[PDB]
Design a binder for this molecule. Structure first.
Ligand SMILES: C[C@@H](NC(=O)c1cc(C(=O)OC[C@@](N)(CO)Cc2ccccc2)cc(N(C)S(C)(=O)=O)c1)c1ccc(F)cc1
Length: 379
């Protein structure tokens, strides 16, 4: 009910749908930058040269504590890619833990389709494990450095408030950020924050697919990915069920593919015609699962208005993927997500800031009985 972590509350911002970032100050004297909170990768990288989309950048020559690692780094993602030089410097998070650590920093000097115009962030904070760090797992991720050099508990939690702001509690959990109970799912393996989905429902209706399909390849949590990305087959079955569940109004095919937008007169969006979506996650006890349920307010994202007009345009934010399921902002904006690294688990609870209406709310409920959940994972 109280909050010893109060100063970290509301420490995140976003330029409405383009990424949640936190201020991080690197080097000496201080150089503060807006850094994208990303749980889908493991490199701490900051723009280090002028870019059209960058208002400011890291200037290594002005930092007396900067140390060159004399090694380059290249990082390509599903979307965008960048190249930089590796080094280390002192790093603190003003509205984060009260510590300063010497961390690895990749100075971004060149990039393609990575930075986002108007997003207001100039770097990325990869919060995932060393296994997926580039060039290799010997480049210690920022959080690993934090835990090794300080006594900050090995845990962080995220509250991404959609519509843009939120909180990144480092080293603990803050009760004012969620309601109800926290339900935990095992981190299957320490590389990406991999989890296991055992069941999927649309408006309470089971999609009825072997659970292996839901995590075909893998299922991860990535705060730096906009949508709820699903394996091809799952996406197709999900779209058909959602269409059938919202038949009171027809939409062009391109809407479901994210290629077309639909706009309603300001404040008229018929949220009620769209179904809620539930993902069941492996629990912490044998044959026990729990489910998280999002509303259309989460998977139907607002598109930067033409100029504050009377037209609310939306994009269907559930898309397909060829690299497994990716639970992005669409999922996270409905909940307070606890990345309990110490106990190799991720917790979910209803967010105190998720967008909902007077009829429905996002939810986290359990427990449920689910057999053979172990088989759901891809080997
Ligand atoms: C910041 C931005 N991310 C993207 O716009 C993005 C990134 C990646 C992606 O591949 O990201 C990989 C990465 N997250 C791994 O860590 C790195 C990354 C971060 C920022 C920009 C590009 C790539 C995939 C996709 N998709 C293909 S999508 C349309 O969502 O299906 C979108 C974003 C995140 C949270 C929000 F609330 C709104 C906007």
């Amino acid at each position: 009910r109280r909050g010893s972590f109060v100063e970290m509350v509301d420490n995140l911002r976003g330029k409405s749908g383009q990424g949640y970032y936190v201020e991080m100050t690197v080097g000496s004297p201080p150089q503060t930058l807006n850094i994208l909170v990303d749980t889908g990768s493991s490199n701490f990288a900051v723009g280090a040269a002028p870019h059209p989309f960058l208002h400011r950048y890291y200037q290594r020559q002005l930092s007396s504590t900067y140390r060159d690692l004399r090694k380059g780094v290249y990082v390509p993602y599903t979307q965008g890619a960048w190249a930089g030089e590796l080094g280390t410097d002192l790093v603190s998070i003003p509205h984060g833990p009260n510590v300063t650590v010497r961390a690895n920093i990749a100075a971004i000097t060149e990039s393609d389709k990575f930075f986002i115009n108007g997003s207001n962030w100039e770097g990325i904070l990869g919060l995932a494990y060393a296994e997926i760090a580039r060039p290799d797992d010997s480049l210690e991720p920022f959080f690993d450095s934090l835990v090794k050099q300080t006594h900050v508990p090995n845990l962080f939690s995220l509250q991404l408030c959609g519509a843009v702001g939120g909180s990144m509690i480092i080293g603990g959990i803050d009760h004012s950020l969620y309601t109800g109970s926290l339900w935990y799912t095992p981190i299957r393996r320490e590389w990406y924050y991999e989890v296991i989905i055992v069941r999927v429902e649309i408006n309470g209706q089971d999609l009825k697919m072997d659970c292996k399909e839901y995590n075909y390849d893998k299922s991860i949590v990535d705060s730096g990915t906009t949508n709820l990305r699903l394996p091809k087959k799952v996406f197709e079955a999900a779209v058909k069920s959602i269409k059938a569940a919202s038949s009171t109004e027809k939409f062009p095919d391109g809407f479901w593919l994210g290629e077309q937008l639909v706009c309603w007169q300001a404040g008229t969006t018929p949220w009620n015609i769209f179904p809620v979506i539930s993902l069941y996650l492996m629990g912490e006890v044998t044959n026990q699962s729990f489910r998280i349920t999002i509303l259309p307010q989460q998977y139907l994202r607002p598109v930067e208005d033409v100029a504050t007009s009377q037209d609310d345009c939306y994009k269907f934010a559930i898309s397909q993927s060829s690299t497994g399921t990716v639970m992005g902002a669409v999922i996270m904006e409905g909940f307070y997500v606890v990345f309990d690294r110490a106990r190799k688990r991720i917790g979910f609870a209803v967010s105190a800031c998720h967008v909902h209406d007077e009829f429905r709310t996002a939810a986290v409920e359990g427990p449920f009985v689910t057999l053979d959940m172990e088989d759901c994972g891809y080997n």
